[PDB]
Amino acid sequence: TTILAVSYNGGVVLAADSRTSSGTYVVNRASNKLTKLTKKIYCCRSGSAADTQALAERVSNYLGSYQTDIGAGVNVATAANLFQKMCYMNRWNISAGIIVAGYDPINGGSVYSIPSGGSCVKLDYALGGSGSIFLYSFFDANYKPGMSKSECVAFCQRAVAHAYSRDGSSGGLIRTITLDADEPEDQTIPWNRSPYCMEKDPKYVTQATQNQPFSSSAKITGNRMSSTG
């Protein structure tokens, strides 16, 4: 699993791979890991699909009840603090690594990493799931806060790709979603048109010189590709 929210000025972008593996076999190829809690408050879901789905629905329900009775919008804080309590109460039973991101009119674009333990850390940008670990360096280098909505999406896609290209667990479609003052813009980059992949990168075209013919010279040439040669 690879997930990440980043905040731009107005709002946030979540981005995710779309692969749920039972280890080494890909059970689903096109999972939505971005899960609507309210209109403008999406959570990303890393770890056991079961447990994040059961928590996403349990919270999306309380935010619904809340949103009705207060007769106003939900603050993203509220979504993250509900999600912290439920991730924390059960922290031993479940295996859930959440990112609550969203927009409320008060604070604007808020992102909360709720990792395993049930910590809850308001940030500029959060990385979750197996394929997080690849991005951390990639962010430290190429991330540059104060991006436009357009760039933050184009970036997150680029990022989720760099991760799912190295991680086995992660792969498939790169679902994003931008949550700001305007109406939520989801888009689903299919793998065939992903911004980065090792297969199409010219770095990795030229094969490693492993096979190598029976020669009369220590001079490495290329691989042996014909039995005639």
């Binding site: 009775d69 207060i70 106003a72 804080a77 509900l82 309590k85």
Partner: protein, 228 residues
């Protein structure tokens, strides 16, 4: 005769008598007055002291519920404190669970549903007091009155107690669009001095409290210099 013994019982006319009765306990109690401004909100309450020997801040009728919201009870004080103790439990559930200061609009409705639950079942009796919830959360400055029935209603200006009638005439003379939280303290306190019977209740003081841009939208007793 049986139509009025419990709250679980409508009369033939269709009204709960035990709730109207608890409502009579509010209208024989010490007069409270409040005023919602643009700046914030002010609650004054006359405390009628029985004995000359009471301390200053004895039978405190005004209680902080959260940072931004305080109740001012008018009616049976002890009952009112059970309301406050609840309102608090709700206001802190809002901070614990939902990570936000309770909205004033909610806190009033949460307190109404509490005071109402005691007008339904036979076991309970209705609450003897009105509560005046004064919040200043993200919904702006808000003033609300939960009466024994559980009937919330938002007010600009409000009067409760035995002077309610005359104290409401004097609240109508004010312009609520204009007045600040600093004027209001003086005028509400001026009202409670004017309406209070001098021959019946010799020993009394005027506990005032506000929440406004002055006090950092924090609900507190005003200092004893602003009161007159």
């Amino acid at each position: 005769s049986g139509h009025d013994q419990s709250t679980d019982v409508f009369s033939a006319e269709g009204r709960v008598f035990q709730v109207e009765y608890a409502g009579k306990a509010v209208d024989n109690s010490s007069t409270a007055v409040a005023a919602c401004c643009k700046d914030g909100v002010v609650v004054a309450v006359e405390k009628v002291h029985t004995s000359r020997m009471l301390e200053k801040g004895s039978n405190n009728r005004i209680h902080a519920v959260d940072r931004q919201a305080g109740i001012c009870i008018c009616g049976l004080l002890p009952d009112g404190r059970a309301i406050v103790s609840r309102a608090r439990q709700e206001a802190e559930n809002s901070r614990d669970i939902f990570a936000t200061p309770i909205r004033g609009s909610v806190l009033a409705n949460r307190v109404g549903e509490f005071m109402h639950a005691y007008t339904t079942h036979f076991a309970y009796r209705p609450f003897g007091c009105s509560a005046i919830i004064a919040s200043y959360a993200d919904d702006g400055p808000q003033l609300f009155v939960s009466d024994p029935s559980g009937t919330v209603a938002g007010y600009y200006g409000v009067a409760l107690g035995k002077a309610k009638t005359v104290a409401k005439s004097e609240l109508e003379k004010l312009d609520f669009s204009s007045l600040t939280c600093d004027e209001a303290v003086g005028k509400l306190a001026s009202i409670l001095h004017e309406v209070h019977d001098k021959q019946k209740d010799k020993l009394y003081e005027v506990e005032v409290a506000w929440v406004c841009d002055k006090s950092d939208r924090k609900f507190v007793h005003v200092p004893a210099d602003m009161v007159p």
